[PDB]
Design a protein around this ligand. Structure first.
Ligand code: HEM
Ligand code: HEM
Lengths: 145, 145
């Protein structure tokens, strides 16, 4: 249940998401592409889903991948801004879920993004505490898949 | 080319776009929905395109329509943030273009959003000069359709 999942976003979890997002969200292009390339490096089996992007191994040099990556960061930006209103958070999460449901992405495969996020945050000096806070936000989307 | 359409946006147009977005972009849920409802009111022929959203006459109460409207405002947020780097603006513009190209939305039909934007801007006291600025940004997307 997406509503129960959303209820998991307590005061301290929301604070950690905001604090960390201030840093990660400052460089959407850089951190967005980092999220994606790490995903393709740690989970090669997911690469097939991104056929439209072309050769994802080109990383930042791939215009389609860059455009996709930036936009992805704005989806996360959207979530952060809706944290105060669970009713609004839920409707945007369900909107993005559809984008993935139509691409045949399960909750399990969607969860594979947790690995990249934890790594990127770690390189930014943000540990498990923050990695776990983000896992909860991700869990909200997984509940709609 | 889209690059030609983008690389031509001037400092004065970027200035007006940013000043107006400061206000319009501060209430993404309200202004986003206003954009959509005004479109349906003045261009009823477009309603059929949004069947996934269900009964769009429900307005704000329609969770699907609300989720779509908020997200659309972030697409614009994206555009606004990439104004000083045509290279990034182009890759994101082309990304959103595909979303519409897939729905068979022509450059002419996409331009229908100009009316709603003009009216919403006006409700906030941003005149024709500001409406023309936005028409120029919309044209960047049109160059890609
Ligand atoms: C933090 C997690 C994630 C977020 C916020 C996110 C966000 C997005 C956004 C905004 C889009 C564009 C939607 C559209 O225009 O159709 C997208 C597309 C896509 N996503 Fe995700 N995504 C995430 C994780 C994943 C994961 C882990 C997978 C699969 C293992 C996945 C697979 C896809 C696919 C297949 C597309 C279509 C790409 C294309 O062909 O253009 N996403 N995602
Ligand atoms: C200010 C210009 C506009 C922006 C920024 C914009 C943005 C968006 C975004 C972000 C989506 C979601 C893409 C996805 O997840 O697949 C979308 C969907 C769509 N847009 Fe636009 N759009 C604009 C104008 C228009 C206009 C004028 C039309 C039609 C004349 C149009 C028709 C559609 C349709 C049919 C969809 C699919 C809706 C659905 O089934 O979920 N858009 N748009």
């Amino acid at each position: 249940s997406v509503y129960d999942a959303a209820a998991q976003l307590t005061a301290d979890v929301k604070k950690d998401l905001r604090d960390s997002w201030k840093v990660i969200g400052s460089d959407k292009k850089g951190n967005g592409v980092a999220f994606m390339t790490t995903l393709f490096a740690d989970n090669q089996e997911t690469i097939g889903y991104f056929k439209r992007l072309g050769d994802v191994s080109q990383g930042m040099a791939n215009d389609k991948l860059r455009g996709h990556s930036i936009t992805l960061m704005y989806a996360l930006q959207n979530f952060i801004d809706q944290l105060d209103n669970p009713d609004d958070l839920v409707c945007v999460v369900e909107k993005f879920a559809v984008n993935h449901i139509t691409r045949k992405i399960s909750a399990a495969e969607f969860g594979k993004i947790n690995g990249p996020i934890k790594k990127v945050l770690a390189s930014k000096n943000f540990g498990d505490k923050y990695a776990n806070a983000w896992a909860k936000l991700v869990a909200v989307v997984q509940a709609a898949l």
